[PDB]
Paper text:
Likewise, the most abundant family identified in the BRD3-BD2 selection (BRD3-BD2 family 3, accounting for 53% of total sequencing reads recovered for the top 500 peptides, including 3.2C) was not found in the BRD3-[name] screen. On the other hand, the family to which 3.2B belongs was identified in the BRD3-[name] screen with a relatively high abundance (BRD3-BD2 family 2, accounting for 8% of total sequencing reads recovered for the top 500 peptides from the BRD3-BD2 selection and 19% from the BRD3-[name] selection; SI Appendix, Figs. S9B and S10). Cyclic peptide 3.2B showed strong binding but relatively little specificity, consistent with the abundance of related peptides found in the BRD3-[name] selection; interactions with each of the six BDs had affinities in the range of ∼10 to 30 nM. Strikingly, 3.2B forms a single, well-defined α-helix in both structures; this helix contacts the AcK-binding surface of the two BDs with a very similar overall geometry and places its single AcK (AcK7) into the canonical binding pocket. It is notable that the AcK side chain enters the pocket at a similar diagonal angle to that observed for AcK5 in the peptide 3.1B binding to the “second” copy of BRD4-[name]. Because of this insertion angle, the hydrogen bond made by 3.2B with the pocket Asn is again mediated by a water molecule. Most of these hydrophobic contacts are conserved between the [name]-[name] and BRD4-BD2 structures, consistent with the similar affinities observed for the two interactions. Furthermore, peptides that belong to the same family but were derived from different selections (3.2B and 4.2A) adopted near-identical structures and binding modes.
Within this class of proteins, the bromodomain and extraterminal domain (BET) family contains four members that are transcriptional coregulators and that recognize acetyllysines (AcKs) using a tandem pair of highly homologous bromodomains (BDs). Despite heavy academic and industry investment in this area, the generation of paralog-selective inhibitors has proved elusive because of the extremely high sequence similarity between the bromodomains of family members (90 to 95% within the acetyllysine-binding pocket residues). Using the highly conserved BET BDs as a model system, we conducted three mRNA display-based RaPID (random nonstandard peptides integrated discovery) screens using a single library (which contains >1012 unique members). Crystal structures of 13 distinct peptide–bromodomain complexes revealed highly diverse structures and binding modes among the cyclic peptide ligands.
Residue numbers in the entry:
A (entry chain C): 1 to 12
B (entry chain A): 63 to 190
Write the structure that this text describes.
Amino acid sequence: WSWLCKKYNLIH
Amino acid sequence: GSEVSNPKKPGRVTNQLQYLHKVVMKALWKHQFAWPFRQPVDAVKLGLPDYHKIIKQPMDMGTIKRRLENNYYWAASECMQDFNTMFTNCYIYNKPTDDIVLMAQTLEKIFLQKVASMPQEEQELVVT
Ligand SMILES: [N]
């Protein structure tokens, strides 16, 4: 939901 | 973290640096695809134990934006190098098929198109 959550799912 | 201000480093405003700040950066910062690049990559929070071994110079749009605001650069070529470093870091660490690589490639294409309309002769600006 958050920036960190989406950044994580994107970079992995 | 990369420095955004240094009194010992020559810096100034030029017509090209002003264009990158008020035209190019203003458009790229608000772009939909910019969200992964607006702040530094946090290897601890993201679980990237080898990021800082592969990436020798981390770079993000927030650092570039602050360098433009602080007159950190001497020439527009320095700002272009930081953008190139930000995009190439993503190309190096991630696989060519990853979605984030295509996001960086698309942002890079916008960046280069906007730079094509930059003033071609660089001239220092001192009037405030
Ligand atoms: N990913």
